[PDB]
Design a protein around this ligand. Structure first.
Ligand SMILES: CC(C)(COP(=O)(O)OP(=O)(O)OC[C@H]1O[C@@H](n2cnc3c(N)ncnc32)[C@H](O)[C@@H]1OP(=O)(O)O)[C@@H](O)C(=O)NCCC(=O)NCCS
Ligand SMILES: Nc1nc2c(c(=O)[nH]1)N[C@@H](CNc1ccc(C(=O)N[C@@H](CCC(=O)O)C(=O)O)cc1)CN2
Length: 564
């Protein structure tokens, strides 16, 4: 089995990238045609002539010319019989206790085809994006692998649907948060169902907005719709029975972008008081904690729940503060855990795009990230560990590589390159860390590859030190146990004595400083040089500008010397 597989995807999104990894790392070939026009889709099928078509993420109908000619399998993020374009939204709004995913054949009627495979799972009360990125994506991977085995077997017959139902596109009126009528549980459900798109509409301080990234608040109380506090740019708003934090909003205008709530509401918030909670404090009630520091068994764990993995200048400085605190604690190891869904996606391109000078903000942001990285590297007397529970891209990957040890959950997808953001040179001391791990030649290959790689592939090529665990929680438990065993071994004290000698030597310190200087001179050129590739790419990314063709790096069937 060395199949030629065509993906049809509206966007080469997290699910499409995970499946690309699983299939190519099994030596199948995967070409991608983006969903631009049915005529383009027909052309791509005739050009590539796939053994099999998989549609991981598709907003419109595959033309009959295609799927009547090539076996076409379609991902649906609901259990068998569920039909419609907003399966997860409805599941969350209705409070389903069980959900699932289905791999079904293309047919004329939407989501009506025979079932090739499916998986079910218990629902979490959580954002739609988190369910999509965890339960749904893991379940779809098992379905596609099972279908591949069925396909190459040759005698598989799919199971036609029996019971079924249709849920239409969900209207905003259903998502709209009414602070006076909605208790906290209802506000969470609506925001969760609409996160990360299209957001739950609401009015806040008289502004029509879309709400994102909600968290319950049990201590602060007030009037429904009253802003009770600010905390790391999230706002806390009274509900019918309590209060909810909203960390991000978007104004309901065509060109607006998702930003920290404080930046969207602006002067409307004048007078609200910051209610700070340091990451290392203990509290007994539910509240919003962007960064959390906890110590167990001689290990200091730093969770940083930065929305979408995007690290603003100010979030970097808050993370830096917590790393400095941890370096002063009696721990043997410091573990950077990111969040369950992302380790890090590097600089925050939205707060950059929103600044008066995106170039100056990029410069602020890359220096802030490098300060975090430098603080990590210059930790002579403690083990540092990156635990990648979730995906990482661009600078977020190289952030992890500054730690002594990098581990990742099974199924994490890595994008250790800058080809989507205008071929940035990158920093985070990659010119020091990457050759140490894989050599200069391989490291340059890694950064020239625009396609994703899995954590398994990253481990096999030496980019990271291990991969284990299927869920974030299992990964965290295995990580703690692995680090605990190490710091309680004789090997740890020998390693630390060596690291003390290396990381306090003038030779080492001057080397890493030169690496930062060289990287930042190159990023300066990216940010400020006459060539504005970086700013153009950031604009397309942040504004989600459509494609009018599939680039040849995705479409094998559209490269220059493509034959047969
Ligand atoms: C890493 C990457 C390839 C992953 O692709 P993917 O799995 O399809 O994930 P998405 O692009 O859909 O990201 C999910 C969300 O996080 C956003 N996001 C990801 N990285 C971001 C970043 N650095 N800054 C701001 N937003 C980011 C995306 O806009 C998207 O937003 P939305 O769901 O609110 O609509 C892609 O997210 C990416 O290129 N991010 C930018 C990394 C970067 O260039 N950082 C700056 C240089 S250090
Ligand atoms: N051949 C064929 N093509 C398909 C599917 C199929 O089974 N058969 N299933 C699709 C995946 N699931 C859906 C289900 C419903 C809708 C849908 O309802 N679209 C509305 C617009 C809704 C929107 O705004 O997104 C329309 O009028 O086209 C879109 C994708 C992929 N395209």
């Amino acid at each position: 089995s060395h199949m030629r597989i065509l993906f049809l995807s509206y966007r080469f999104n997290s699910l499409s990238q995970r499946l690309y990894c699983e299939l190519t790392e099994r030596e199948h070939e995967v070409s991608v045609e983006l969903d631009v026009h049915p005529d383009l889709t027909v052309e791509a099928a005739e050009l590539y002539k796939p053994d099999l078509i998989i549609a991981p993420f598709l907003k419109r109908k595959i033309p009959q010319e295609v799927w009547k000619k090539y076996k076409t399998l379609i991902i649906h993020p609901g259990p068998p019989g569920d039909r419609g374009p907003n399966a997860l939204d409805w599941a969350i709004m209705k409070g389903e206790r069980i959900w699932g995913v289905t791999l079904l054949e293309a047919s004329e009627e939407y989501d009506a085809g025979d079932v090739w495979a499916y998986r079910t799972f218990p629902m979490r009360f959580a954002r739609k994006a988190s369910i999509y990125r965890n339960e749904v994506t893991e379940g779809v991977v098992e379905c596609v692998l099972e279908a591949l085995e069925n396909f190459e077997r040759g005698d598989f017959k799919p199971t036609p649907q029996k019971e079924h139902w249709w849920n239409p596109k969900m209207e905003q009126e259903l998502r709209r948060v009414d602070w006076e009528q909605d208790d906290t549980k209802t506000v969470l459900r609506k925001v969760y169902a609409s996160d990360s798109q299209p957001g739950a509409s609401s009015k806040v301080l008289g502004k029509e907005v879309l709400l994102f990234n909600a968290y319950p608040e049990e201590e602060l109380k007030g009037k429904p719709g009253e802003v009770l506090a600010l905390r790391d740019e999230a706002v806390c708003i009274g509900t019918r029975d309590g209060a909810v934090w909203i960390t991000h909003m978007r104004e309901r205008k065509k060109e607006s972008i998702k930003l920290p709530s404080a930046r969207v509401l602006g002067e409307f918030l004048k007078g609200v008081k910051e209610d700070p909670i340091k990451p290392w404090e203990k509290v007994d009630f539910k509240t919003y904690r962007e960064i959390l520091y906890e110590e167990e068994d001689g290990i200091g764990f730093i969770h940083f729940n930065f929305y979408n993995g995007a690290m603003s200048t100010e979030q970097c400085y808050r993370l830096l503060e917590t790393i400095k605190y941890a370096k002063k604690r009696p721990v043997k190891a410091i573990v950077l855990l990111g969040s369950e869904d992302f380790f890090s996606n590097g600089m925050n391109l939205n707060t950059i795009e929103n600044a008066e000078s995106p170039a100056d903000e990029s410069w602020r942001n890359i220096n802030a990230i490098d300060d975090v990285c430098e603080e990590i590297l210059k930790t002579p007397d403690k083990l540092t560990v990156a635990g990648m529970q979730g995906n990482a891209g661009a600078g977020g990957v190289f952030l992890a590589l500054t730690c002594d040890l990098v581990f990742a959950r099974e199924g994490v997808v890595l994008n250790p390159h800058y080809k989507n953001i205008g071929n940035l040179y990158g920093s985070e001391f990659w010119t020091y860390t990457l050759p140490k791990r894989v050599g200069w030649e391989k490291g340059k290959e890694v950064m020239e590859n625009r396609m994703p790689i899995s954590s398994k592939k990253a481990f096999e090529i030496g980019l990271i030190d291990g991969v284990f665990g299927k869920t974030p929680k299992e990964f965290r438990q295995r990580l703690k146990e692995r680090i605990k065993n190490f710091i309680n071994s004789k090997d740890f004290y020998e390693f630390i004595e060596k690291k003390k000698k290396e990381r306090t030597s003038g030779e080492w310190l001057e080397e890493i400083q030169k690496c930062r200087e060289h990287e930042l001179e190159k990023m300066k050129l990216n940010f400020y040089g006459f060539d504005t590739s970086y700013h153009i790419a950031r604009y397309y990314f942040v504004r989600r500008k459509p494609h009018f063709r599939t680039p040849p790096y995705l479409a094998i069937h559209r490269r220059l010397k493509f034959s047969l």
